[PDB]
Amino acid sequence: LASGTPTVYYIRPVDVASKDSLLTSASLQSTICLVGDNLKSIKGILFNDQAAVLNTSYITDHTLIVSVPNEIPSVVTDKMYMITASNDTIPYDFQVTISAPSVVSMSNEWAKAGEEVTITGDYFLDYDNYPLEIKVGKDYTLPREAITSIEKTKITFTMPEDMPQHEDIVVSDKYGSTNAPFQYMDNRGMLFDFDTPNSVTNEVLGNSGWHDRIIQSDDTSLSGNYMQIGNTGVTMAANGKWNDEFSFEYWAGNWANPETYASHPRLCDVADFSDWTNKSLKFEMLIPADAGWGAGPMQIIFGSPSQISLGNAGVVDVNGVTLAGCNNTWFHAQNGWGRAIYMPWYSNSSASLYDTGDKWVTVTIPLSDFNLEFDGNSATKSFSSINDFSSLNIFLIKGAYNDKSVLPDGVECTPIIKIDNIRVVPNK
Numbered sequence: 182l183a184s185g186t187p188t189v190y191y192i193r194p195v196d197v198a199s200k201d202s203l204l205t206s207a208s209l210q211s212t213i214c215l216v217g218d219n220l221k222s223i224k225g226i227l228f229n230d231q232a233a234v235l236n237t238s239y240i241t242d243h244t245l246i247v248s249v250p251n252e253i254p255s256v257v258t259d260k261m262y263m264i265t266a267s268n269d270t271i272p273y274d275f276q277v278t279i280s281a282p283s284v285v286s287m288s289n290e291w292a293k294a295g296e297e298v299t300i301t302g303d304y305f306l307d308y309d310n311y312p313l314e315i316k317v318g319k320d321y322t323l324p325r326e327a328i329t330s331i332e333k334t335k336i337t338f339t340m341p342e343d344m345p346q347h348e349d350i351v352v353s354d355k356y357g358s359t360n361a362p363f364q365y366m367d368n369r370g371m372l373f374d375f376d377t378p379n380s381v382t383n384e385v386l387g388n389s390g391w392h393d394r395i396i397q398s399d400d401t402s403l404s405g406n407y408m409q410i411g412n413t414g415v416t417m418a419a420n421g422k423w424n425d426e427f428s429f430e431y432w433a434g435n436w437a438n439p440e441t442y443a444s445h446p447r448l449c450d451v452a453d454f455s456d457w458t459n460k461s462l463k464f465e466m467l468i469p470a471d472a473g474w475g476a477g478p479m480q481i482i483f484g485s486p487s488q489i490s491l492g493n494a495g496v497v498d499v500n501g502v503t504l505a506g507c508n509n510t511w512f513h514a515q516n517g518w519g520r521a522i523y524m525p526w527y528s529n530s531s532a533s534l535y536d537t538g539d540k541w542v543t544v545t546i547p548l549s550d551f552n553l554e555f556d557g558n559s560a561t562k563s564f565s566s567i568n569d570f571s572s573l574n575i576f577l578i579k580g581a582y583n584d585k586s587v588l589p590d591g592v593e594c595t596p597i598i599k600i601d602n603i604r605v606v607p608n609k
């Protein structure tokens with residue numbers, strides 16, 4: 182309608198109670214107001230390469246109100262292009278604020294040199310004028326040649342031989358830097374690597390209960406010894422029936438009276454479980470392709486010395502706790518006790534054989550998700566103290582309280598689950 186070249190003196194927000202009186206940037210879908218003259222000479226507006234929608238009814242010759250498009254720009258120039266009726270382009274420098282990268286998981290936090298590693302998250306956006314980078318520590322930057330592909334949710338790279346271990350990992354791009362919730366060869370909050378003696382009793386923790394599991398190392402090892410649940414040809418029923426062949430048990434204590442925990446210490450003394458709601462249980466896991474896991478949910482149960490211990494019942498420890506002794510009722514006592522139940526073989530109301538292609542993958546289970554009970558219903562008693570992380574059970578079983586079960590059946594299988602590097606780590 183109007184004539185002349187549009188100008189913009191400044192950009193202000195559109196709502197009344199705004200903190201800002203002027204904007205040099207704006208998020209997606211943000212409604213902004215241009216303050217210039219001859220603004221009705223504007224026929225189109227593009228933010229970067231994204232065209233905006235102009236409502237003629239709210240465009241005076243001194244104010245134009247437009248909302249930033251929702252789509253992420255593919256080529257970012259930090260300019261808003263105003264197009265006149267004659268298709269002339271008038272650029273006004275203006276940045277479209279995009280969320281910083283979010284880092285959630287790494288495929289194998291213990292990946293060896295040469296292995297294909299994928300980092301899963303969101304807002305991994307790579308541009309020519311501003312490349313995304315992975316920085317480990319303070320002096321190392323991941324070479325771009327190691328990176329094979331970058332998608333919005335996944336970054337894929339080939340692990341160099343010399344990436345710094347046990348250091349912070351930062352994913353940075355044009356829109357900011359964010360620390361990864363993991364480290365390379367992460368050993369923080371280390372509980373069972375089955376190789377290194379623990380810091381308190383100078384013992385390499387392993388079996389400490391009734392049903393001892395395989396702990397060995399061979400050509401399939403990720404790092405030294407691993408712990409194995411199941412074996413070749415050992416059948417797991419589709420209904421997840423009780424079978425101690427799929428139970429790993431570490432019970433604190435070693436038949437001492439009084440129980441000093443001089444042997445088999447409490448897990449809460451081996452690693453720090455304070456502020457557990459902001460922490461997660463992590464471990465690396467291998468399931469052979471020929472030994473898929475398709476039935477029997479994995480119940481990971483932490484317990485206090487009041488519930489379970491390696492010894493006789495009635496013994497008191499150096500903490501005044503009356504030990505429960507050896508038992509297998511504490512994790513199914515119908516008392517609302519919370520435990521995590523991991524079941525990747527159950528995907529969208531249907532059960533299938535889950536394996537991991539004979540590779541080691543890192544599994545993250547936040548301690549806040551230990552809120553189920555043996556039957557699968559929501560747990561009524563949460564964690565109350567760090568003392569509740571003294572013993573650990575890993576049991577592949579579908580529980581059924583009072584002949585009723587909420588967890589689902591699977592398919593009959595012969596699963597082999599190799600586990601190493603059981604640790605507890607901060608969520609961030």
Ligand SMILES: [Mg+2]
Nearest residue numbers: 374404405406
């Ligand atoms: Mg190991």
